[PDB]
């Protein structure tokens, strides 16, 4: 049966894993990450995306073991897609926080098998719906919805900034000014700045995009200069 | 009847069908089939799941050539056991490392081709003697619509049954396009 | 396993590190894979024996540091799934889709628990249409990064920063065989280096007809490498 | 492929030679494959001889992986005997004709299957396919033992051509491949 | 596993549909065998190889479907060998006969191999058949296949107990002969082998307007 | 850990296999056997000395199907789990391969599947030596003794438990003397007293009906004695010498 | 640290996976045993120190025939080493012989033994086999060959080598006499030789098993009239085979 | 519509080891069957590791195949 | 789950009969045609309903069965053994050889001493009956150890019991008829109490004889154990 300590212990490998924040907006979810440093001779040109699709219109980031994060998103893609052609219709995006919580509670549950060192954000839209979604799993297969939540490394004091900029009454108010928080957020933490930073931005139907490292030098070179204007104030 | 027609000119596939009937794999390739009205839609869609799964897993296309031998394997698998039933399927893509349209048929054996035009249902005896004639290399779209209406004409002309209103489709470098002849 | 941190897995992690030494270096033609055999004996025979370098099929190829037994057990698995793949698909297995299954295997290892993980890291070479050549590194907790220039095994950081401060991204195959021997001559603590110590791979062009050219070493290619590049 | 059951090989042996033939030119629905120096030649149902095609190419590319050298005609005979016979009961509608140089010895084989894998090994030549009774016969008119390697492409050449011979042109096709201890080639006649 | 039926629903169509079928290979023609003064014999008709090994001093007969008479008497000379290299002793006749019996009652006549069994062991000499059925037969001459009726005519006229090698080599070449000169000029010659309770199994083979020229290098 | 499953130890050795082996020495009790011309006798002495016992019940010889059977030193339970195990191979070769279970086959057998429990963690090997005795059509008498290791070998002459060191010794010089590699007497008679003889002198103790369990294997049958032939036997040792 | 469930040859914090070298130090412990390849033929080789001076050491064949052209011979657990062997022999028939009609080569029937040995150290609740193996035999194209196998199922080729209790003695004298000119003749008296400088007991065609697969024997196939078929290439030195080379000592 | 021995065969080894087990319990009584099954369900339960395919060494000495092949040991289904 | 030690002794074993040495203690004698089986109680309340209490079990019509150690252990044997008995019935057609139940039993148990997943059973059972060659006594232990026996006893009492069964059969060369055997029995088991006798117990008796039974299992009542009774107690007076 293992012992309760495994799940304490699980969750301290997820709080040396690199920061994970996501956000709702009035009309879309996003998703942003601390991408580790590449390391000299890494390779560029297919650097692993850290945030990762399990369909058109659920996304997914997490802190801690990225080996454990594989056979989630593959657990979760053949979900998704298992259950599109069973039951006619895109899965849920509750749903698929239910099945990832049922495979991380199944391997909390079975004294066999190690619990996985990862906690989740999950995030999306459900199939013609406009309210974003947004999730949070964790290796004991708990789960909770969310207005705005980090984890993995320094992320107690992004959370202190978010409760400190964000309101659950009223959202950054339209698209632009979720990357305005997001990129802000992970300023207080990402040291080494715009290269670190990862943000991927959904909208209603399936529109889900990848902000390239011209976008967030482009936020980074407008938070960078409202803070001049700030300290000249 | 429910005929499938498939043209292959310089830089696109045309796909026809009578009166649903075809799968969007990728959005650079079509399946227009025809068959027994039960089992065809299901191996349709397990098809489409399986070509959107690996899809989504490697954010890269699968070429038309392997989807074509994807499809020629599922086929011969699910023959094995229960008994051979009705079905015909055309793949028509655009493969984006060579440059070129491409257009393969499979029947129900597993019997996979690539020619310049396929059909089936009975009626495509009418078709093969017009393709014949005009089919050439180096067509242009438009010459494709043009061969189709022909052939939608004398197919017409031999068939007062609901053969009415084809639904057309035109894959090429720009993706998937649902055109008219009207 | 305690305290957010995995023990038997930084344990295989340690088990790599005495496994003699792997190096892969990618150029604009092509790959190179170059390993040292830990074993000598003057009773061992040196020729026929794969030790360190093994094809998965033509277009692709992996170095070992770690257990050999563990090793040929992956390889046969990923051997299986690459014609599987040429059986479903008609095509060549892009080598991103077999390093992720070997990968996934190793992870499995890893998480049950009557299992030990699999003590071998693998440097993989190989080209397919997607990204051209592709160099990959996977190790005994299943995660695995795509590199330039790397090596696995024994010295794994002193190798690196010589690949570091001497590797170019423009090079052609026939430059990085003296920077992989070069590396090698200065990660080898065993004394000095011969033809039979060494083991190559190249995965190159060819003739430009859709080739794709594995050129497996012998005693005879290897010694001429050697004493081509500063060594007699 | 249509009318597929009366698609057609000849195989054949000469002085350190093999050569097997194959109605098509049409170049479709080939089935004379390669997989080394070994040949087979297939004769029957078009969905067979490809999905028999995947699966000698799987086994074969495994052999060569796992046993570092190319599969003999020999072995290839043993390999497809003992594969179409794990079919037993619903077999591969199939006639495959192997055929090569053993690398070893450098004497030509050529060998024949019935459905279940039972060889035909037969040191002159073989014919398969579902009407070639008639081009037996024309081949035990017109065989004679140790043929040099172009008087062989011109027996066989021949048998083909008095074979089915209402249309030389349009429909007619044959592979002439010829299979010698270093050079393979194949003809379009 | 194993033996598959994979094609048994698409064959039945396909022969339902006109495709019809390749045709297996049937060696209906005759078989016999005769035990002797120090040893066993048996014999077998060729036309266009119908004698199997299941060890070195026990031997077939085959009639039937030729790849199955080959397959399971290989499959079972596998277990033999295994099964004298298990116990490392020399392996009987009966155990061959006993492995065959429970095989094709493994089966129930799909597999259409019709087997002379014969040999020597530890025991003696020995020779059975065994039919489709997993039915067997025993006695000191046997005959199975198209001849039988002819060949045992000529064996209970001519056989004797104290019937030596050369003797018993005529009577069975005979035999087979009888089952030959019944439709002559078919086949001829006579595999035979010569189960000898002390020595080597002694086997005896045959006993008697230029067109297209388009190429490329592949 | 290296003392409650069956896993290398630190000097490479396997301590429950040790612990199987002690268990052989638990029931104080020695067998003996001897191969003759024409037969194969085993002893075992029966020893009740000082209980409510009921000696027809108290064995350790336990015949195997027609023409074998063995003796058994070690825990009475594990000698009938192996005699089931014993009994039950012999009857199902007689199936598969057409003939009489040869002695060889059946101590490998029972041997291999000591390997099993030796090897195999959740498993406990079986605490007992197991000497299986019979007339081949073969290689005629037959000694074969197995042990909780999974070892096996054929034997001439063999003792087994407290003091096998003793009795071993006794026929190491008789064979050492005649050499003949068995006992040559023509009859079965004369094989139970010569193996009654030298048990008698090496136990230091003379043997009666109530001290004795023996079996005698000849190529038609394996037989225990009753104690009534016993003492036939024992009267005819005291009448010879 | 370890304490991860059942699995059992863990790795230790240096790495070493603890288990297998116990299992080395089984093989160590064990009997010597040896093999030579020469030009035109290779040896395999023990010592049958005995169990019961009573013992019928006929019956303990420690060579064993994997199949015709292919023998082995070990050090440590004889059980485990029987195993091995009745898979090894059942292996050699299903995947190879009976899809192919001809016996496996040595390179891949040492592979099919050495997985097993990978597999029972990978699985919960079964310790390595505590035995070292060396397989010999022949093949068409790869020719002659040698091999050691270790309890972690790691195998490679080698010319000559020894396994067991003498093995550092025994390779110090392989090295100053393997030559690449050997004949089998002269393979089997170094043979010979090697275990005579091990053996504690008393030394003699009792004592010492020996074998070679060296010449094809048709006075061994046990029938005649099949042309083709080449006799297994199996020489079991019998004790007055060794008695007659013993001379020469 | 399916193959006569298509069922026939698919449930065999489990049919003959049913049957086996059955006369143990006959014959032996209840003690001799379970101790097989038990000894089956410890061999079936510690033996797992995902790429594994010739079952297990052991296995072959309790069913007693440990030099025996059936087609089924020659043509692995995979 | 802990299965071997330093003296090849089974661990759990030492500990499963510890039980035994804390149930109620029992007598069974082999009488000239038959068994009689005897036990004390454990009176500690008179909630005991009287009559329904019973420790000696039926197995079969003419077998018999009584026990000390963990009572779930053993009613499990029990069960197992109106099973194993029932089955030999559904065969052979005819009733068990006690012999061939014994073994049944003992093969049974130590299937459970054996893996590294299962208990010994912590319980020792006397059983017996009457069959085709007579009466049969075994006394089968947690080890899985049995053996026939002229008489035995077991639990708590064991070492004065003992003492007194070899006075029964010491003193007598041919042992006791059943109607003997019925008042002797009762003398030990109010004997063997000495070191208990501050809590009283109830005298159960049963038998099974091929005369005085017909070689079908009875229990004994009324007059018999009142005679019995009225022979224990002038006999412990």
């Known amino acids: 049966d293992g012992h309760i300590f495994q799940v304490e212990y699980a969750l301290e490998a997820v709080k040396r894993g690199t920061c994970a924040v996501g956000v709702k907006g009035k009309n879309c979810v996003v998703l942003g990450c601390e991408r580790r440093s590449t390391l000299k001779l890494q390779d560029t040109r297919i650097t692993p995306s850290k945030v990762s699709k399990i369909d058109s219109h659920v996304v997914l980031s997490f802190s801690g073991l990225n080996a454990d994060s594989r056979i989630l998103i593959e657990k979760a893609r053949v979900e998704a897609q298992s259950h599109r052609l069973t039951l006619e219709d895109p899965v849920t995006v509750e749903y698929l926080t239910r099945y990832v919580a049922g495979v991380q509670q199944r391997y909390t549950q079975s004294g066999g098998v190690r619990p996985f060192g990862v906690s989740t954000l999950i995030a999306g839209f459900d199939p013609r719906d406009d309210e974003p979604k947004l999730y949070q799993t964790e290796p004991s297969g708990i789960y909770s919805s969310w207005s705005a939540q980090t984890i993995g490394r320094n992320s107690k004091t992004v959370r202190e900034f978010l409760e400190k900029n964000y309101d659950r009454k009223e959202p950054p108010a339209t698209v632009e000014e979720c990357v305005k928080l997001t990129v802000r957020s992970l300023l207080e933490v990402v040291q080494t700045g715009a290269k670190n930073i990862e943000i991927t931005v959904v909208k209603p139907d399936s529109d889900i995009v990848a902000l390239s490292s011209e976008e967030i030098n482009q936020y980074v070179t407008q938070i960078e200069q409202e803070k001049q204007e700030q300290q000249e104030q | 009847m429910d005929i499938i027609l498939g043209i292959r000119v310089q830089d696109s596939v045309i796909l026809a069908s009578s009166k649903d009937k075809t799968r969007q794999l990728s959005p650079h390739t079509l399946m227009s089939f025809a068959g027994e009205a039960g089992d065809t839609v299901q191996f349709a869609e397990y098809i489409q799941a399986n070509i959107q799964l690996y899809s989504i897993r490697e954010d890269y296309e699968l070429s038309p050539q392997a989807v074509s031998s994807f499809v020629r394997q599922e086929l011969a698998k699910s023959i094995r056991s229960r008994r051979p039933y009705q079905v015909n399927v055309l793949i028509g893509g655009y493969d984006k490392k060579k440059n070129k349209p491409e257009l393969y048929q499979i029947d129900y054996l597993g019997t996979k081709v690539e020619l310049p035009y396929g059909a089936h249902g009975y009626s495509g005896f009418y078709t093969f003697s017009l393709l014949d004639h005009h089919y050439r290399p180096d067509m242009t779209t438009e010459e494709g619509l043009d061969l189709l209406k022909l052939c939608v004409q004398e197919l017409e002309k031999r068939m007062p049954m609901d053969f009415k209103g084809v639904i057309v489709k035109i894959v090429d470098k720009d993706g998937i396009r649902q055109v008219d002849d009207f | 396993s305690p305290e957010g941190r995995l023990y038997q897995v930084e344990y295989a992690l340690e088990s790599i590190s005495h496994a003699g030494t792997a190096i892969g270096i990618m150029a604009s033609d092509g790959i190179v894979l170059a390993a040292e055999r830990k074993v000598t004996s003057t009773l061992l025979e040196q020729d026929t024996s794969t030790e360190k370098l093994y094809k998965l099929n033509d277009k692709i190829a992996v170095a070992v540091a770690g257990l050999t037994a563990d090793a040929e057990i992956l390889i046969n698995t990923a051997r299986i799934h690459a014609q599987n793949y040429l059986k479903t698909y008609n095509e060549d297995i892009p080598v991103e889709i077999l390093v992720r299954r070997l990968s996934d295997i190793k992870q499995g290892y890893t998480q049950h628990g009557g299992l030990r993980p699999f003590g071998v890291s693998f440097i993989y070479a190989g080209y397919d249409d997607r990204y051209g050549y592709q160099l990959y590194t996977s190790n005994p907790s299943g995660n695995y990064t795509g590199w330039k220039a790397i090596s696995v095994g024994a010295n794994t950081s002193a190798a690196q920063t010589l690949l570091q401060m001497d590797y170019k991204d423009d090079m052609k195959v026939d430059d990085a065989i003296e920077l992989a021997l070069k590396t090698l001559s200065k990660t080898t603590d065993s004394s000095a280096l011969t033809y039979d110590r060494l083991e190559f791979a190249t995965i190159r062009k060819g003739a430009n007809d859709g080739e794709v050219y594995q050129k497996i070493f012998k005693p005879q290619e290897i010694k001429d490498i050697l004493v081509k590049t500063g060594i007699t | 492929p249509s009318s597929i059951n009366g698609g057609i090989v000849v195989a054949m042996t000469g002085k350190d030679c093999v050569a097997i033939a194959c109605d098509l030119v049409s170049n479709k629905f080939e089935k004379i494959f390669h997989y080394g120096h070994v040949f087979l030649g297939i004769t029957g149902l078009a969905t067979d001889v490809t999905t028999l095609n995947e699966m000698f190419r799987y086994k074969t590319n495994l052999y060569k992986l796992k046993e570092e050298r190319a599969i003999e005609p020999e072995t290839f005979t043993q390999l497809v005997s003992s594969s179409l016979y794990e079919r037993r009961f619903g077999p591969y509608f199939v006639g495959p004709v192997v055929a090569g140089i053993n690398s070893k010895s450098g004497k030509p084989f050529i060998a024949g299957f019935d459905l279940i894998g039972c060889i035909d090994e037969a040191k002159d030549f073989i014919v398969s396919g579902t009407a070639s009774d008639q081009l037996f016969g024309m081949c035990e008119s017109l065989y004679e033992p140790n043929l040099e390697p172009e008087d062989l492409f011109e027996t066989i050449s021949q048998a083909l051509l008095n074979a089915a011979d209402r249309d030389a042109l349009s429909g007619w096709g044959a592979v002439v491949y010829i299979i010698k201890k270093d050079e393979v080639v194949k003809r379009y006649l | 596993a194993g033996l598959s039926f994979d094609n048994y629903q698409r064959n039945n169509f396909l022969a339902e549909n006109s495709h019809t079928q390749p045709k297996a290979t049937s060696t209906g023609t005759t078989i016999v065998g005769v035990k002797f003064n120090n040893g066993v014999v048996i014999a077998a008709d060729t036309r266009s190889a119908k004698l199997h090994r299941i060890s070195p001093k026990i031997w077939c007969a085959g009639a039937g479907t030729a790849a199955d008479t080959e397959a399971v008497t290989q499959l079972i000379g596998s277990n033999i060998e295994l099964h004298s290299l298990y116990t490392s002793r020399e392996p009987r006749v009966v155990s061959a006969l006993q492995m065959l019996k429970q095989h094709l009652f493994k089966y129930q006549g799909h597999i259409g191999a019709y087997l002379i069994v014969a040999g020597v062991d530890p025991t003696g000499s020995h020779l059975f058949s065994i039919h489709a059925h997993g039915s067997t037969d025993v006695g000191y001459y046997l005959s199975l296949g198209s001849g039988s009726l002819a060949a045992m005519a000529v064996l209970e006229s001519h056989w004797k107990q104290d019937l030596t090698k050369e003797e018993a080599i005529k009577l069975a070449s005979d035999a087979i002969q009888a089952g030959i000169w019944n439709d002559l000029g078919s086949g001829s010659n006579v595999d035979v082998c010569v189960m000898e309770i002390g020595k080597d199994a002694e086997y005896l083979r045959n006993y008697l307007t230029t067109a297209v020229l388009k190429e490329s290098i592949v | 850990y290296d003392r409650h499953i069956t896993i290398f130890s630190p000097e490479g050795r396997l301590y429950q296999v040790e612990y199987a082996f002690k268990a052989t020495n638990q029931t104080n009790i020695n067998s003996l056997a001897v191969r003759g011309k024409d037969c194969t006798v085993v002893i075992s002495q029966k020893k009740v000395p000082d209980k409510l016992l009921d000696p027809t019940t108290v064995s350790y010889i336990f015949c195997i199907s027609r023409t074998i059977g063995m003796v058994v030193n070690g825990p009475i339970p594990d000698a009938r789990n192996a005699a089931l195990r014993a009994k039950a191979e012999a009857a199902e070769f007689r199936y598969k391969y057409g003939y009489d279970m040869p002695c060889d086959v059946l101590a490998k057998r029972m041997a291999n599947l000591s390997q099993i429990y030796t090897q195999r963690a959740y498993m406990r090997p079986l605490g007992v030596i197991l000497t299986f005795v019979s007339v081949d059509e073969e290689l005629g008498p037959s000694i074969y003794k197995t042990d909780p290791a999974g070892y096996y070998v054929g034997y001439k002459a063999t003792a087994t438990g407290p003091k096998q060191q003793e009795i071993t010794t006794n026929l190491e010089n008789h064979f050492k003397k005649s050499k003949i590699d068995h006992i040559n007497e023509e009859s079965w008679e004369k094989v139970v007293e010569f193996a009654i003889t030298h048990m008698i002198d090496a136990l230091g103790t003379e043997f009666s009906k109530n001290d004795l369990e023996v079996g005698v294997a000849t190529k038609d049958k394996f037989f225990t004695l009753s104690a009534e032939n016993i003492e036939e036997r024992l009267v005819a040792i005291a009448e010879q010498d | ?143 002659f060959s040698l091999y050691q196998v270790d309890p972690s199922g790691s195998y490679f080729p080698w010319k000559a080598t020894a396994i067991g209790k003498g093995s550092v003695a025994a390779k110090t004298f392989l090295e100053k006499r393997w030559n690449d000119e050997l004949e089998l003749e002269d393979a089997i008296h170094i043979a010979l030789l090697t275990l005579k400088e091990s053996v504690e007991g008393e030394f003699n065609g009792d004592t010492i098993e020996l074998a070679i697969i060296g010449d094809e024997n048709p006075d061994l196939l046990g029938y005649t009239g099949i042309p083709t078929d080449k006799g297994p290439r199996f020489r079991k030195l019998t004790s007055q085979e060794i008695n007659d080379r013993l001379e020469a000592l | 519509d399916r193959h006569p021995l298509e069922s026939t065969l698919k449930n065999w080894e489990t049919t003959q080891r049913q049957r086996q087990m059955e006369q143990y319990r006959q014959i032996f009584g209840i003690a001799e069957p379970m101790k097989r099954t038990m000894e089956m369900e410890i061999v079936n339960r510690t033996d797992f590791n995902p790429l594994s395919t010739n079952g297990s060494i052991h296995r072959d000495i309790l069913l007693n195949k440990e030099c025996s092949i059936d087609w089924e040991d020659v043509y692995p289904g995979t | 789950n802990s299965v071997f030690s330093p003296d090849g002794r089974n661990f759990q074993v030492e500990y499963a009969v510890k039980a035994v040495e804390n149930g109620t203690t029992s007598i069974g004698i082999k009488c000239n045609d038959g068994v009689v089986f005897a036990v004390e109680k454990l009176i500690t309340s008179k909630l005991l309903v009287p009559q329904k209490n019973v420790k000696i079990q039926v197995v079969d019509r003419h077998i018999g069965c009584v026990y000390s150690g963990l009572i779930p252990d053993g009613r499990h044997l029990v069960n197992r053994g109106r099973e194993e008995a029932a089955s030999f019935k559904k065969l052979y057609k005819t009733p068990i050889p006690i012999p061939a139940f014994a073994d049944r039993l003992g093969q049974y148990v130590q299937a459970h001493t054996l893996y590294n997943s299962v208990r010994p059973f912590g319980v020792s059972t006397i059983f017996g009956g009457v069959d085709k060659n007579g009466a049969h006594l075994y006394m089968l232990e947690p080890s899985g150890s049995y053996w026939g026996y002229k008489g035995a006893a077991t639990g708590k009492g064991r070492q004065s019991a003992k003492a007194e069964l070899e006075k029964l059969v010491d003193h007598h060369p041919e042992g006791l008829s059943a109607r003997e055997a019925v008042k002797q029995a009762a003398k030990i088991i109010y004997l063997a109490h000495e070191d208990n006798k501050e809590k009283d117990f109830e005298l159960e008796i049963s038998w099974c004889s091929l005369s005085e039974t017909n070689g079908l299992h009875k229990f004994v009542k009324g007059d018999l154990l009142q005679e019995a009774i009225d022979f224990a107690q002038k006999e412990i007076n």
């Open chain 7, 1 to 143: 640290t370890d304490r991860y469930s059942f699995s059992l040859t863990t790795f230790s914090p240096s790495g070493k996976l603890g288990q297998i070298d116990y299992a080395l130090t089984a093989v160590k412990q064990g009997v010597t045993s040896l093999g030579i390849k020469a030009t035109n033929g290779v040896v395999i080789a023990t010592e049958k120190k005995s169990s019961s001076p009573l013992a019928m050491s006929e019956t303990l064949s420690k060579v064993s025939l994997l199949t015709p052209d292919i023998g082995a011979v070990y050090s440590g657990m004889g059980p485990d080493y029987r195993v091995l062997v009745d898979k090894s022999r059942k292996v050699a028939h299903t995947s190879y012989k009976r899809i192919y009609g001809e016996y496996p080569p040595t390179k891949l029937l040492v592979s099919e033994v050495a997985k097993i040995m990978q597999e029972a150290t990978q699985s919960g609740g079964v310790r390595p086999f505590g035995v070292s193996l060396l397989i010999a035999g022949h093949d068409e194209f790869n020719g």
